[PDB]
Amino acid sequence: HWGYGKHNGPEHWHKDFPIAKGERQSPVDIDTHTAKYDPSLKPLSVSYDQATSLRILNNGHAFNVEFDDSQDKAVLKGGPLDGTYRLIQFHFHWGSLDGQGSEHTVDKKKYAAELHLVHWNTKYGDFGKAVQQPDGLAVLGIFLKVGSAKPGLQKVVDVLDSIKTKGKSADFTNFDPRGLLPESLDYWTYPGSLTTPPLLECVTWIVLKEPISVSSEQVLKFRKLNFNGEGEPEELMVDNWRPAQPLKNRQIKASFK
């Protein structure tokens, strides 16, 4: 029953998910001047060449592109991570207008959208067991700004008409998530949480410094999706982002000088 509206949005989540007021919540504002370069971070490795995308699903909050995670086909390692983290899905958060939409902010700047590539630590065997661990997940976050079109996003854009409403899915095989990355893998990292209920504090966040550029037309198509199911009153799927949460006793580390 949670959502993003006045009556079920982020200010209400704590009543059913009390960890919403926890010590390690996400997203956060990334104060770039306070974030410190960390020489102990190892090189980050995004290894997506063998990824197997399967399906795209409108879940009533966002849309998820799902992957086969039954083997180490698309993994994230290095950087702040101990071991191997396997890609399970990606999704986005976006705004009703280009001036808002991201979850993380950079010196208070909100981007038009934010991509989350979600991975689980293979030492825990399955995603469900990983979300019972303080180092169970790694989410690679990538900001979207509006400018030139992102070619590797267009296949996603053009399938959205077929998953307009909650509960709809479509085949989405042979999609290469490498087409959603920027050139640089410079990043900030900190320990946090899922940004939607159940808000579990399991995530090592890795937020890339370089945004990707997408066209106005691409993001406008995100905004034509619906939160509601077929046959129900239409509510545009926009502003599906949680605002920045208190940093508490955390430090954000930078991979770059």
Ligand X SMILES: NS(=O)(=O)c1ccc(CCO)cc1
* Binding-site ranges for Zn ion (CB under 5 A): 116
107 binds, among Zn ion, ligand X, none (CB under 5 to 8 A by kind): ligand X
To the nearest whole angstrom, how small is the minimum distance from the Cβ of residue 231 to Zn ion?
A: 27
Q: Which of 1, 7, 14, 61 is an active site residue?
A: 61
Cβ neighbors of 47 (< 8 A, separation 6 or more) are 74, 75, 76, 77
226 binds, among ligand X, Zn ion, none (CB under 5 to 8 A by kind): none
User: What is the CA angle 237-189-140, rounded to 5?
Assistant: 40
Structure tokens at 223: 């905004």
Report the alpha-carbon distance of residue 24 to residue 191 in Å, rounded.
Answer: 7
- Nearer residue to Zn ion within complex by CB, 74 or 203: 203
Cβ neighbors of 71 (< 8 A, separation 6 or more) are none
Is residue 138 involved in binding ligand X (CB under 6 A)? Answer: no
To the nearest whole angstrom, how small is the minimum distance from the Cβ of residue 133 to ligand X?
A: 14
Instruction: Find tokens 């849309």 and name the residue.
Output: 63
- Nearer residue to ligand X within complex by CB, 89 or 121: 89
Compute CA 56 distance to the chain's CA centroid, rounded to the nearest angstrom: 15
Site string for ligand X, 1-40 (x = CB under 6 A): xx----xx---xx-xx------------------------
Per the annotation, the verdict on 12 as an active-site residue is: no
**Residue 161: φ, ψ to 5°:** -60, -25
- Nearer residue to ligand X within complex by CB, 1 or 257: 1
Is residue 201 involved in binding ligand X (CB under 6 A)? Answer: no
Residue 14 labeled ligand binder: no
Of positions 44, 81, 113, 118, contacts ligand X by CB under 6 A: 118
Report the alpha-carbon distance of residue 238 to residue 61 in Å, rounded.
Answer: 9
Report the alpha-carbon distance of residue 169 to residue 252 in Å, rounded.
Answer: 37
Collapsing DSSP to helix, strand or coil, 90 comes out as strand
Q: Binders of ligand X among 172-191, rule CB under 6 A?
A: none
DSSP per-residue string spanning 151-216 = GGGHHHHHHGGGG-SBT-EEE--S--GGGG--S---EEEEEE--SSTT--S-EEEEEESSPEEE-H
Is residue 57 involved in binding ligand X (CB under 6 A)? Answer: yes
Is residue 114 involved in binding ligand X (CB under 6 A)? Answer: no
Residue 196 labeled ligand binder: yes
Q: Which residues are annotated as a binding site for Zn(2+)?
A: 91, 93, 116
Residues serving a catalytic function are 61
Which residues are at the interface with ligand X (CB under 6 A)? 1-2, 7-8, 12-13, 15-16, 57, 64, 66, 69, 88-89, 107-110, 116, 118, 127, 139, 194-196
